[PDB]
Design a protein around this nucleic acid. Structure first.
Length: 69
RNA sequence: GCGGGUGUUUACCAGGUCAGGUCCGAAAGGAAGCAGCCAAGGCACUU
């Protein structure tokens, strides 16, 4: 379960836009997303880095909920 | 070696285009621009 499936699953428009600025590798291996990438992304989707982190924050909790059944 | 071709590779770090999202604007319209793609470079092979 990567950022892709989570993509298929109105704050949504923004959560989609953020993921839509990532590369295929970033959507598949979310951990490789550190500072520099975050800035590229944040700016790429007209967002604030803090927002991106929120997005990553959610997907993480969402991820865990998966790895429990 | 020069040129051509082919496979593959490359988040951002002044190439082009720019979905989605963003900014300015009441609006009409403007601005920037990630991913993709194209191009370009790399690693090889080839002619």
């Amino acid at each position: 379960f990567d950022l892709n499936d989570f993509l298929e699953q109105k704050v949504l428009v923004r959560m989609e836009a953020i993921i839509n600025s990532m590369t295929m590798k970033e959507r598949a291996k979310p951990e490789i997303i550190k500072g520099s990438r975050k800035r590229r992304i944040a700016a790429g989707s007209g967002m604030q880095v803090q927002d991106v982190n929120r997005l990553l924050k959610q997907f993480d909790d969402m991820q865990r909920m998966m790895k429990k059944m």
